[PDB]
Design an enzyme around this catalytic site. Structure first.
Site, PDB file in Angstrom:
ATOM      1  CG  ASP B  60       1.888   5.590  -1.073  1.00  0.00           C
ATOM      2  OD1 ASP B  60       2.427   4.491  -1.349  1.00  0.00           O
ATOM      3  OD2 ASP B  60       2.069   6.525  -1.888  1.00  0.00           O
ATOM      4  CG  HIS B  62      -0.065   1.134   0.994  1.00  0.00           C
ATOM      5  ND1 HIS B  62       0.226   0.142   0.068  1.00  0.00           N
ATOM      6  CD2 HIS B  62       0.922   2.047   0.890  1.00  0.00           C
ATOM      7  CE1 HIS B  62       1.319   0.482  -0.596  1.00  0.00           C
ATOM      8  NE2 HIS B  62       1.731   1.669  -0.144  1.00  0.00           N
ATOM      9  CG  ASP B  88       1.828   2.219  -3.845  1.00  0.00           C
ATOM     10  OD1 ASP B  88       1.696   1.525  -4.900  1.00  0.00           O
ATOM     11  OD2 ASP B  88       2.988   2.340  -3.273  1.00  0.00           O
ATOM     12  CG  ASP B  91      -0.388  -5.022  -1.653  1.00  0.00           C
ATOM     13  OD1 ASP B  91      -1.194  -5.971  -1.633  1.00  0.00           O
ATOM     14  OD2 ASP B  91       0.434  -4.824  -2.573  1.00  0.00           O
ATOM     15  NE  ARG B  92       4.114  -2.417   2.618  1.00  0.00           N
ATOM     16  CZ  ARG B  92       4.482  -1.804   1.482  1.00  0.00           C
ATOM     17  NH1 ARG B  92       3.778  -0.737   1.087  1.00  0.00           N
ATOM     18  NH2 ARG B  92       5.566  -2.177   0.791  1.00  0.00           N
ATOM     19  CG  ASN B 120       5.405   0.586  -6.163  1.00  0.00           C
ATOM     20  OD1 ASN B 120       4.696   1.503  -5.718  1.00  0.00           O
ATOM     21  ND2 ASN B 120       6.189  -0.195  -5.368  1.00  0.00           N
ATOM     22  CG  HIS B 121       2.074  -1.810  -3.413  1.00  0.00           C
ATOM     23  ND1 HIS B 121       2.230  -2.938  -2.636  1.00  0.00           N
ATOM     24  CD2 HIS B 121       3.216  -1.102  -3.267  1.00  0.00           C
ATOM     25  CE1 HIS B 121       3.384  -2.876  -1.985  1.00  0.00           C
ATOM     26  NE2 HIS B 121       3.993  -1.752  -2.332  1.00  0.00           N
ATOM     27  CG  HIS B 169       3.270   5.390  -7.048  1.00  0.00           C
ATOM     28  ND1 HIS B 169       2.472   5.711  -5.965  1.00  0.00           N
ATOM     29  CD2 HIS B 169       4.114   4.394  -6.622  1.00  0.00           C
ATOM     30  CE1 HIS B 169       2.825   4.958  -4.928  1.00  0.00           C
ATOM     31  NE2 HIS B 169       3.831   4.171  -5.297  1.00  0.00           N
ATOM     32  NE  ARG B 217      11.202   2.768  -3.345  1.00  0.00           N
ATOM     33  CZ  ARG B 217      10.099   2.832  -2.596  1.00  0.00           C
ATOM     34  NH1 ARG B 217       9.430   1.738  -2.253  1.00  0.00           N
ATOM     35  NH2 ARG B 217       9.663   4.028  -2.174  1.00  0.00           N
ATOM     36  CG  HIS B 244       7.184   5.071  -4.566  1.00  0.00           C
ATOM     37  ND1 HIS B 244       6.807   3.729  -4.575  1.00  0.00           N
ATOM     38  CD2 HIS B 244       8.437   5.103  -5.103  1.00  0.00           C
ATOM     39  CE1 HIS B 244       7.828   2.997  -4.997  1.00  0.00           C
ATOM     40  NE2 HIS B 244       8.831   3.800  -5.306  1.00  0.00           N
TER      41      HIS B 244
END
Ligand code: MN
Ligand code: MN
Lengths: 59, 295
Positions: B60, B62, B88, B91-92, B120-121, B169, B217, B244
């Site tokens: 990740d 991000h 990923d 995001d964030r 998944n993002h 992932h 989740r 992940h």
């Protein structure tokens, strides 16, 4: 600011003949398994073990 | 009017040394080109990649672009090292656009030596919410976010390194019997709520369970060490590499050493004190870890 990219050779094997060679993966011995980097640390990295790493990360 | 990937990379890399935050300002049609050109490479390449070593594998990011630049600094810039990223990208973090644009630019430049999988993002219904859509609207427009969505919908889903390391992932699926199941997935595709493609991007290992159980989740499942052991035995493989989940050392083994989680965003979000890791696989299939302290 410049890379040596005149001799890049593909690692994509989907079409290609099964590599005649075969080997099982192995992790390096624990004393050489990890290199840690950082501002506090030397550029080329410090070679530590799993437990040694946790000390450096979380003194 | 003719787009220059070398120039874009040069500009993305000019901020090496700069304080973590300096934006790079690509033009809209440059970003559109990176999306459409990289999308076509993804479609032309298999959905289940078969790769051979040497390669460096990363988890990740991000949106933490300055940590991506560090990974390259210590791991080597493409094409000095070969790379597989496990998803990923966005995001964030605060700089999702720079992060994904550098990755797409290197995919275009070194298409058979630089690989990025879907996380998944990389899914519109997730990254509408968790920050990427906001950043795209703030700096460009809604249309540009849809252009990324069409690109992400064509990413590959998993890879197999030298027939021995299976990389994705999220994790395994209770529906995964044959690798042919993955090859048959058609693109472009969204990530569905349930089933094989969902699980590969959403599932997690759980050291304390046996078999398959719920996932906190609210999506997919958890799987225990016995599942990993049997998978590898049945599929004649030796290691699962996945991402992940944040892990304090940046890497973390599971099921003895049959699975490793890699996470490459140090000080993730600012609320964790984790390091980030990259696993290196050399020509003779010797594996080690390069670890980044939080800067
Ligand atoms: Mn993530
Ligand atoms: Mn994820």
């Amino acid at each position: 600011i410049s890379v040596q990219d005149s001799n890049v050779q593909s690692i994509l094997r989907n079409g290609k003949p099964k590599k005649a060679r075969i080997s099982s993966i192995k992790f390096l011995d624990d004393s050489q398994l990890i290199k840690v980097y950082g501002d506090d640390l030397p550029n080329q990295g410090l070679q530590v073990s799993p437990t040694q790493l946790k000390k450096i990360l979380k003194p | 009017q003719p787009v220059d990937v070398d120039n874009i990379i040069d500009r993305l890399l000019e901020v090496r040394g700069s304080k973590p935050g300096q934006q790079v300002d690509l033009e809209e049609n440059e970003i559109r080109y990176l999306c459409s050109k990289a999308r076509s490479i993804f479609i032309k390449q298999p959905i289940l990649l078969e790769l051979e070593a040497p390669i460096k594998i990363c988890g990740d990011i991000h949106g933490q672009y300055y940590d991506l630049l560090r990974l390259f600094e210590y791991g080597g810039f493409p094409p000095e090292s070969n790379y597989l990223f496990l998803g990923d990208y966005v995001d964030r973090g605060k700089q999702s656009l720079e992060t994904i644009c550098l990755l797409l630019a290197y995919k275009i430049k070194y298409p058979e030596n630089f690989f990025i999988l879907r996380g998944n993002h990389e899914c519109a219904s997730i990254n509408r919410i968790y920050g990427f859509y906001d950043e795209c609207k703030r700096r460009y427009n809604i249309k540009l976010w849809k252009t990324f969505t069409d690109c992400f919908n064509c990413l590959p889903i998993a890879a197999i390194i030298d027939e021995k390391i299976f990389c994705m992932h999220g994790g395994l699926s209770p529906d995964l019997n044959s690798m042919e199941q993955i090859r048959r997935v058609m693109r472009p595709t969204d990530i569905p709520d349930v089933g094989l493609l969902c699980d590969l991007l959403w599932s997690d290992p759980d050291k304390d369970i046996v078999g398959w159980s719920e996932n906190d989740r609210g999506v997919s499942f958890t799987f225990g060490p016995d599942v990993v052991n049997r998978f590898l035995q049945k599929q004649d493989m030796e290691l699962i590499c996945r991402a992940h989940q944040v892990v304090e050392d940046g890497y973390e083994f599971f099921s003895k050493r049959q699975l490793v989680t890699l996470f490459s965003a140090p000080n993730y979000c600012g609320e964790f004190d984790n390091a980030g890791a990259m696993m290196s696989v050399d020509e003779s299939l010797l594996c080690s870890f390069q670890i980044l302290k939080p800067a």
